[PDB]
Structure 1
Amino acid sequence: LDVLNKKYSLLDHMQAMRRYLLLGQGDFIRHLMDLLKPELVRPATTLYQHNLTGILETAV
């Protein structure tokens, strides 16, 4: 358990899952969705993976 906490942050990883994958960072999730809206309204064929990753990093 000490190794898991110090090296893999298992409890911290679970808290991160809650904050991000469970949309716990609601202000962050709101801003991400707002930024994606002009992209996410577009046809998925028009999405650029590099552009989507950059948008994700920018919103973060």
Structure 2
Amino acid sequence: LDVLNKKYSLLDHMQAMRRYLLLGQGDFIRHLMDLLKPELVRPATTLYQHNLTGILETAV
């Protein structure tokens, strides 16, 4: 358990698994949804991931 939580930092994974993935932080999320308003309200048949990643970087 000692080597797993220091050399690979197992606990940081849980701490970032709530804050981000389970939407546990929300300073991030409200600005994220704000930037993703005009893009996601537009129909997603013409949506490709490269437009998401670049605005995601600014938001994070």
Counterparts of 2:8 and 2:40 in 1: how far apart (Å)? 33
Gaps of 5+ in 1: none
11-20 vs 38-47, which moves further: 38-47
Partner of 2:36: 36
Separation (CA, whole Å) in 1 of partners of 2:22 and 2:11: 15
Match of 1:2 in 2: 2
2:56 is aligned with 1:45: no
CA shift at 1:26, angstroms?
0.6
For this pair of structures, how many residues does the alignment match? Answer: 60
Q: Choose between structure 1 and 2: higher helix proportion.
A: 1
% identical aligned pairs: 100
Structure 2: segments with no counterpart, 5+ residues: none
Cα offset, 1:16, TM superposition: 0.3
TM-score, length of structure 2 as denominator length:
0.87
How many Å separate the matches in 2 of 1:50 and 1:7? 32
* Structure 1 segments (4+ residues) deviating >3 Å: none
TM superposition shift of 1:46 = 2.4
